[PDB]
Amino acid sequence: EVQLQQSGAEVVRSGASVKLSCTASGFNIKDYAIHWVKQRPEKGLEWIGAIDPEYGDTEYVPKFQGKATMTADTSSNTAYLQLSSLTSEDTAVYYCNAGHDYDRGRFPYWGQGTLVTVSAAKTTPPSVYPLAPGSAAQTNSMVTLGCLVKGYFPEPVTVTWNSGSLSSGVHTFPAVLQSDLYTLSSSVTVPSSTWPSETVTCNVAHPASSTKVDKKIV
Amino acid sequence: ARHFFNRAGEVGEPVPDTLIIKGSGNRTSVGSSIYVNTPSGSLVSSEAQLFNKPYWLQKAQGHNNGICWGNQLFVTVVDTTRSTNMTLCASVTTSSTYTNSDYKEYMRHVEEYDLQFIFQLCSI
Amino acid sequence: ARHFFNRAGEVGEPVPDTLIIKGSGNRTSVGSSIYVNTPSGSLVSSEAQLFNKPYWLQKAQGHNNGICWGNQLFVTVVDTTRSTNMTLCASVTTSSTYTNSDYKEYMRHVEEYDLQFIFQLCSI
Amino acid sequence: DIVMTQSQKFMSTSVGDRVSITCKASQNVGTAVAWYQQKPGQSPKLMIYFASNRYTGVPDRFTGSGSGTDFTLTISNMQSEDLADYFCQQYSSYPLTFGAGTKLELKRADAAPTVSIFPPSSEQLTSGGASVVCFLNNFYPKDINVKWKIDGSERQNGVLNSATDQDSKDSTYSMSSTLTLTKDEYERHNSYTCEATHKTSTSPIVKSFNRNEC
């Protein structure tokens, strides 16, 4: 029952500020030492700073001083992290971590993660295309089905099939960036007695744009 | 007086020039001249106790010879001979080895009193 | 109790498993739990002296009311208030400079007593 | 700035074996070192902190060790669920620093891929575009080559490949290959073929379809 909820992914143009929030870390009388970690796909993990609710103490990294500003609201709440002049090097996933009660080293309680994308253009919704077998040259046993997600921005998209049911035999392929747009692929394998006997539908949820639902037909 | 030490920060009222011969090559900056001593209550003993023994108001120092006007009585008590602060330690977890992060330390103090009075009825 | 310290060597009787949470990465070996303290006689004063003043055996605690059977008397005395140990230094040689090898140090203690009695003749 | 240098970026092993990951410090940090585990698409989970103390949660399978400047994480007998990234962290002095990523992969036995080709859907062909996909699922080892043939001729331009990391459940790999053409160019040819060559067979696995027949 100790989980940390953040603000959510945001697409920002260059030169604008963004404010990230945390939850359930930072109470009166307790006490915590909240840390923030940046995850760049190239530099791994980078520590940002350590803030203590009930005191509002602040420690930063010389790399991020002037880039990251930290605030703490003693009621509720906590912990707000805001970045000023956003550049391409700030595109990363930020985590709000709290070692239990105090200290540095310990991050046993991590936030859900917030993906910030600092770039131009705009949020383009995904194009979902079904991938059905060809004619009658397949039959038993077991059939592979797929849904192709092309021309979307930004990462990520959530691809599910039978409304959360059936999690075995699925394959989610990493996205590929081409022409400043992403492309994802997903496949699922079901027995031949299942499809097209019962319906198989793939759901593509894109938080910055729109959710789509597409059923697979012969 | 247990120990002596000086305060950090600027001396608001500096030592007069007439009282110190300035040095020193080095030094030159007059050290902090704000002295304070830590107190200490020394030994507490049962022979020094004022309580747990009766007091009879034979004669009052003032003109009010123990008359509780308004049917009320104010009894003030200060007792530092029972000021022991108990330390409580609660475990959040129990690691395989001893780790300070597994325990929370608390401060608790208690005071126990029993007020006993004997009054005399009076008419006016 | 002047000072506290622990003994070196193996602990013949270790602390029970129930009473210590073992650590610690390092540590792991329980320190010596054989504690003993040095004593100190504190202040010696003339007001605390038992001697150099007469004592009259008015009444005895036992049935023998001061009768010296066998015409002998045992008087036991313990007096640590005059335990000063004198240090003696004898010169073996006298070098041009000061050298510790030229002197021998000795320990000497003295005790001076004067037993005074007053007896009463009795017949049986 | 204390630099955390981990030996290898990737690490090979098999189910049941014993793995040791090393973390070298640029300064003496005593025992102020913590280890974390991060699975793909998830937030890191604390494993060991204070060099050799397991956090509430973590099985006795994981053991930390070291002091000063050389630290090591050991996994005595493995499970499929242990496939993830492992980081070491220094917290002796600010700023806090982490080590480079370390991917643990399994050496589990080598299966042949399952190849399925899919022509462009009728819906996508209405948009003026045509994408032909080819899924290569549950193969080992990673080394594999996909060849696209259009009317028997090898096609190089327009291919997009996406290789999956090792599956956390059965230690297999997957790959998706998408050939994207215009509808005009797609309708000018008949035969489309996806060939997968892998070390588990001396002949390529061929999946094909004809535009006219399907």
Automatic annotation (TrEMBL), chains B, C:
Protein name listed in UniProt: Major capsid protein L1
Subunit relationships: Self-assembles into homopentamers. The capsid has an icosahedral symmetry and consists of 72 capsomers, with each capsomer being a pentamer of L1. Interacts with the minor capsid protein L2; this interaction is necessary for viral genome encapsidation. Interacts with protein E2; this interaction enhances E2-dependent replication and transcription activation.
Name of the gene this protein is made from: L1
Parent sequence residues shown: 253 to 376 of 500
Family: Belongs to the papillomaviridae L1 protein family.
Its biological purpose: Forms an icosahedral capsid with a T=7 symmetry and a 50 nm diameter. The capsid is composed of 72 pentamers linked to each other by disulfide bonds and associated with L2 proteins. Binds to heparan sulfate proteoglycans on cell surface of basal layer keratinocytes to provide initial virion attachment. This binding mediates a conformational change in the virus capsid that facilitates efficient infection. The virion enters the host cell via endocytosis. During virus trafficking, L1 protein dissociates from the viral DNA and the genomic DNA is released to the host nucleus.
Localization (cell): Virion; Host nucleus
Domain of life: Viruses
Record field: transmembrane: none
